Amino acid sequence: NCPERELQRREEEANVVLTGTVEEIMNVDPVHHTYSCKVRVWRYLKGKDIVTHEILLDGGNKVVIGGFGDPLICDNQVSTGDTRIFFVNPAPQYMWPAHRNELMLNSSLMRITLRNLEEVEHCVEEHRKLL
């Protein structure tokens, strides 16, 4: 078993949460031993406004996500054609230019099922109620 933070904590530590399809595996980051992929976004579950103002989208619905293969994350691998729920954050400036204009994976990838979609949306809405 691989220890994973509670859903509550994960939603809290990820400013952007989206669903999408892996279209292409891109380059490797030899320093952190991770890789990036081009992902066609379907819908945002959180942080859509953050992506709109800080990321230059390709073709209007495609983004690059990096950090796959990270040892700190339990479910961290993908192949072309995979569909998942991604918990990510825009890459900080100190990770530029290697990860410039990329969203970085923050916690385990989740499969696309209505149960997962419902639970994640609820956790996002609850955290928003404290507002």
From Swiss-Prot:
Glycans are attached at N106. The record marks N116, L117, K129, L130 as: Cleavage. This is Agrin N-terminal 110 kDa subunit. It comes from the Eukaryota. Transmembrane segments: none annotated. Disulfide bonds join C2-C74. Residues 2-131 form the NtA domain. The chain holds residues 25 to 155 of 2081 of the full protein. Is involved in modulation of growth factor signaling. Involved also in the regulation of neurite outgrowth probably due to the presence of the glycosaminoglcan (GAG) side chains of heparan and chondroitin sulfate attached to the Ser/Thr- and Gly/Ser-rich regions. Also involved in modulation of growth factor signaling.
